[PDB]
Symmetry: C2
Subunit: 104 residues, 2 copies
């Protein structure tokens, strides 16, 4: 159940952006899910705060939750679309893809 | 219930590091907790991926979870302690304090 990156595919169709975007159809967005608890393995990228907090937790659940499995690195994407005026454009949306997850 | 930073204080005593550390006793570590769902207000710092994912979710819960409320910025700390040999030292532990949370 450990914290890891999972697959997720966005079809512009789904989001309704079906219309303006020439390309692509959709993309690989991915998503972070899993648990952050000991063993906090290294390829599970935990910060220091994550350990303390994972630990305090263990001493005192009521006190504090485990850290959440969130994305540690994001990659931008580029879609080509028809703005108004009917100019064909290229936009770079940043922070759209998840590259890596971890306990933070 | 919205995603925000909360107070948390670590007493070196609790962690057992009671002994080697001259100073401080403990510190303000803070922790991120709360929900990531619309309204994804701005002072709730959400990435793009966070919106898509918050949205896909809403279309298809089964499909994907809301983003998790994780710390967006960390601050290091310095503790003064007795290493072996009985040298009094100053260490900077990085990423110990949470400065800010948000939906990522």
């Amino acid at each position: 159940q450990a914290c890891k990156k999972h697959e997720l595919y966005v079809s512009f169709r789904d989001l309704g952006w079906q219309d303006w975007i020439i390309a692509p159809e959709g993309y690989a967005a991915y998503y972070c899910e899993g648990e952050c608890a000991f063993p906090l393995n290294s390829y599970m990228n935990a910060t220091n705060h994550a350990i303390v907090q994972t630990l305090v937790h263990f001493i005192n659940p009521e006190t504090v939750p485990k850290p959440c499995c969130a994305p540690t690195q994001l990659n931008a994407i580029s879609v080509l679309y028809f703005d108004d005026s009917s100019n064909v454009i290229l936009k770079k949306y940043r922070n759209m893809v998840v590259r890596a997850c971890g306990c933070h």
